[PDB]
Design a protein around this nucleic acid. Structure first.
Length: 53
DNA sequence: TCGAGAATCCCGGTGCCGAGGCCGCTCAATTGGTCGTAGACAGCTCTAGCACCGCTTAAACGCACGTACGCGCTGTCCCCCGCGTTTTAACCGCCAAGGGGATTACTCCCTAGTCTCCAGGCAC
């Protein structure tokens, strides 16, 4: 399974990893940080979508 | 009244702790040949704003009832405030234990680079 769906989530991981890789935010990057961004933004999106419903 | 002696005003001397300067120094500032890579210009199109107005069209300008309330005055009424008095803990100095902050670095572990194969993703 790809990294965008290995954790069973909704938001893509490769998209935010490509955004930080060329956005020049650090020298290196840990493996847990893009999926952590994935989890935080998908939880914020799900909460505001439940409130929108 | 003279004069000597004690008190005080003003002038001169001296601690004193913060601003200024300094020797030693030691990991950064300079320059360099190179090298993959940003980037600036240009044909060419294509596409979004602008003007005129065809045709309607609600909406603002401005004046007229009228009464709600902003500003000012008058009376009320009371609650912080100056002040006195009693209490109290803050600041300072000091004795004491010790505990995380700082500095050194190594295997290991996670990433830049690499190529290779595949499943996402807005357009038809």
């Amino acid at each position: 399974q790809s990294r965008s769906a290995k954790a069973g989530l909704t938001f893509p991981v490769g998209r935010v990893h490509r955004l930080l890789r060329r956005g020049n935010y650090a020298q290196r990057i840990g493996s847990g940080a893009p999926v952590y961004l994935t989890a935080v933004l998908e939880y914020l999106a799900a909460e505001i979508l439940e409130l929108a419903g």
